[PDB]
Structure 1
């Protein structure tokens, strides 16, 4: 759909490495909805069809 919410969260954080530059490989803060939309789950929440 490529619709409203995706769209990403403006995408850095931590400390190393402020916004306004190139990140190649590392680890990152990924998407938000425009509707707010971050933060995000890590979860311990699933059902029976899978472990």
Structure 2
């Protein structure tokens, strides 16, 4: 709730069409990684109980 540091997310293009400095269009595919984790946030396949 308080806004922990580490919620900063680099926005980085997944497609090779776009590059750093290009404005993001609505509806494209993008990958998100934190500023100080270096691990892109993904959706796993391990179901919960």
TM-score bracket, shorter-length normalisation: 0.5 to 0.7
**Deviation of residue 8 (structure 1)?**
0.7
Aligned length: 48
Segments of structure 1 that go 5 or more residues without pairing to the other structure are none
Segments of structure 2 that go 5 or more residues without pairing to the other structure are none
CA distance in 2, matches of 1:22, 1:35: 23
- Tell which structure's C-alpha radius of gyration is larger: 1
TM-score (norm 1): 0.56
